[PDB]
């Protein structure tokens, strides 16, 4: 009645059929044997795995409500503990998601206000890149510093200074723990956390980075508290603190300190690392494909010129750039196995029975590479998103933000950011790699919770 799967063993589950370094390939390999909907045992964790566009959409959209539970990610769980918008369920989820979305729009998200803040931050990126003077640099932290400062404005009320030493450490905490969950040990940790949380190893260093992140947010919330102005909130924290006061006499409130810290961390973390990873990966692809870089240039120069900052609406007259960013997001597949769902009630899903509470892995990468939707899914080709007339072409299999009732509500911000950061950088610079285009390796460094591109250095050269 449960979907079919390989026969597990007590405690280790499907250990023998799973290569923890490449969980994605391991899971896809077994679906070729059992079909697109199958059961797996990640140690004692029983998970139903959804592969391909059809399986994922049918579950997460067509049976949207039944599949709207949030599952676990054991590493982030160590810090969040089911608190915060991301890992919440039921009433907690309802309240915090609703609140978060509204307060984000209230601070400019999806509006003129945050476009300007992205624009301003992009100029600061251009300045920093200008300052390198075309030298061979690691782009990692130039990018993350810029991305992070958009969401930081919303939640903390101001950007960090680029020379802020603490800001860099915050960014390292985010990079290191994100990377960890993408490694072989990280993915083993998803199977065996009940043991591994108490053992020495890479898990502990990731925990202490998560701890550093929690500590800063806690600290920021306290400062905000002692200086709070109930009539004029400066940031996301303030709005949340204001609601906490309004709800002090409701004993079943979801608005209390721990949910504040964790939601704030959720957004600071998700609002920094993913766009940063996507950008980092984008530029590596662009250097691998010099001819794609040239069309991006051709379009930018013809549509925007050189004398003004790119803006969000330039999107509509830039089908190629839109296709390029989509392909980067499709190819880069930053969240390859989505973020775990779970069934809200006993569920009938296409001839299978899934008991209430059953965890679900929506294999987002398998949709992004679904051969029914993209002609050459393993290649980087912006034509995946283009008409024969050269106009932009939507895809139902373009699901990097996932789909359904618990989909990424940072999508708006992220789309704007990607459009602005990519265009403004490509407008002002051309890219020079350390190695020859043929020698560049755009295969991932790590694939686990996230897809991480290999470490590289590069030059940003003025046009
Ligand atoms: C390229 C950029 C991004 C990608 C690819 C991405 C991807 C994802 C994915 C795959 C999920 C799981 C959705 C699901 O459960 O079906 C998710 C959830 C989430 N993301 Fe993003 N994200 C991005 C940027 C952002 C940003 C900028 C923010 C904050 C402004 C953000 C905040 C969140 C939150 C709060 C959730 C959980 C929503 C919930 O549980 O209700 N993300 N994201
Ligand atoms: C680590 C970032 C977010 C968090 O706090 O816990 C899980 C979540 C993952 C995520 C959501 N949107 C983008 N990412 C990378």
From Swiss-Prot:
**Effect of mutating residue 387 to D:** In allele CYP2A6*28
Annotated substrate binding sites:
76, 266
- Pfam families assigned: p450 (PF00067)
Kindly list the GO CC terms recorded for this protein: cytoplasm; cytoplasmic microtubule; endoplasmic reticulum membrane; intracellular membrane-bounded organelle
What outcome follows a substitution of residue 79 to L?
Answer: In allele CYP2A6*24; increases phenacetin O-deethylation activity 4 fold
Gene3D superfamilies assigned to the protein according to its UniProt record, in alphabetical order: Cytochrome P450
> How is this protein situated with respect to the membrane?
Peripheral membrane protein
Q: What is the effect of changing residue 129 to H?
A: In allele CYP2A6*2; unable to catalyze 7-hydroxylation of coumarin; causes switching from coumarin 7-hydroxylation to 3-hydroxylation
Impact noted for substituting residue 407 to Y = In allele CYP2A6*24
Triggers of expression: By phenobarbital and dexamethasone.
Where does this protein reside within or beyond the cell? Endoplasmic reticulum membrane; Microsome membrane
Any one biological process term the GO annotation gives: coumarin metabolic process
Outcome of substituting residue 97 to Q: In allele CYP2A6*6; loss of activity
Q: Extract the GO molecular function terms from the UniProt entry.
A: arachidonate epoxygenase activity; coumarin 7-hydroxylase activity; enzyme binding; heme binding; iron ion binding; oxidoreductase activity, acting on paired donors, with incorporation or reduction of molecular oxygen, reduced flavin or flavoprotein as one donor, and incorporation of one atom of oxygen
Alphabetical keyword list: Endoplasmic reticulum, Heme, Iron, Lipid metabolism, Membrane, Metal-binding, Microsome, Monooxygenase, NADP, Oxidoreductase
Outcome, altering residue 440 to T? In allele CYP2A6*7
Which EC class is the enzyme in? oxidoreductase
Q: Which CDD domains match?
A: CYP2A (cd20668)
The keyword Metal-binding is assigned to this record: yes
Cofactor entry: heme
What is the role of the protein in this entry?
Exhibits a high coumarin 7-hydroxylase activity. Can act in the hydroxylation of the anti-cancer drugs cyclophosphamide and ifosphamide. Competent in the metabolic activation of aflatoxin B1. Constitutes the major nicotine C-oxidase. Acts as a 1,4-cineole 2-exo-monooxygenase. Possesses low phenacetin O-deethylation activity.
Q: PANTHER family from the entry?
A: CYTOCHROME P450 2A6 (PTHR24300:SF180), CYTOCHROME P450 508A4-RELATED (PTHR24300)
Q: Can you say what this protein is called?
A: Cytochrome P450 2A6
Recorded name of the encoding gene: CYP2A6
């Amino acid at each position: 009645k449960l979907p079919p799967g390989p026969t597990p063993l007590p405690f280790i589950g499907n250990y023998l059929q799973l290569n923890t370094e490449q969980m994605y390939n391991s899971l896809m390999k077994i679906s070729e044997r059992y079909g697109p909907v199958f059961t797996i045992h990640l140690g004692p964790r029983r998970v139903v795995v959804l592969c391909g566009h059809d399986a994922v959409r049918e579950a997460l959209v067509d049976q949207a409500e039944e599949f709207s539970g949030r599952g676990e990610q054991a590493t982030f769980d160590w810090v969040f503990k089911g608190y915060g918008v991301v890992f919440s369920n039921g009433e907690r989820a309802k309240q915090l998601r609703r609140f978060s979305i509204a307060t984000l729009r209230d601070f400019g998200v999806g509006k003129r206000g945050i476009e300007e803040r992205i624009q301003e931050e992009a100029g600061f990126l251009i300045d920093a890149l200008r300052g390198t003077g075309g030298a061979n640099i690691d782009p990692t932290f130039f990018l993350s510093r810029t991305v992070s400062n958009v969401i930081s404005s919303i939640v903390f009320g101001d950007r960090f200074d680029y020379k802020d030493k603490e800001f860099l450490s915050l960014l390292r905490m985010m990079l290191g723990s994100f990377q960890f969950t993408s490694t072989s040990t990280g993915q083993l940790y998803e199977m065996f956390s009940s043991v591994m949380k108490h053992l020495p190893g890479p898990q502990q260093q990731a925990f202490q980075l998560l701890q550093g992140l929690e500590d800063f947010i806690a600290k920021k919330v306290e400062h905000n508290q002692r200086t709070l102005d109930p009539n004029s909130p400066r940031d996301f924290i303030d709005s949340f603190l204001i609601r906490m006061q309004e709800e002090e006499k409701n004993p079943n409130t979801e608005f209390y300190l721990k949910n504040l810290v964790m939601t704030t961390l959720n957004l600071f973390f998700a609002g920094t690392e993913t766009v940063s990873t996507t950008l980092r990966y984008g530029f590596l692809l662009l250097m691998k494909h010099p001819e794609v870089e040239a069309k991006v240039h051709e379009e930018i120069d013809r549509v925007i010129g050189k004398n003004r900052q790119p803006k969000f609406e330039d999107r509509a007259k830039m089908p190629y750039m839109e296709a390029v960013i989509h392909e980067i997001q499709r190819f880069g597949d930053v969240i390859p196995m989505g973020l775990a769902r779970r069934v809200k009630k006993d569920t009938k899903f296409r001839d299978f029975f899934l008991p209430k509470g059953t965890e679900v892995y929506p294999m987002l990468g398998s949709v992004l590479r679904d051969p029914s939707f993209f002609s050459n899914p393993q290649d980087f080709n912006p034509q995946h998103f283009l008409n024969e007339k050269g106009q932009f072409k939507k895809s139902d299999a373009f699901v990097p933000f996932s789909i359904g009732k618990r989909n990424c509500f940072g999508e708006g911000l992220a789309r704007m950011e990607l459009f602005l950061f990519f265009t403004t950088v490509m407008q002002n610079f051309r890219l020079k790699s350390s190695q020859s285009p043929k020698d560049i390796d755009v295969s991932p460094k790590h694939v686990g919770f996230a897809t991480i591109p290999r470490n590289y250095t590069m030059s940003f050269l003025p046009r």
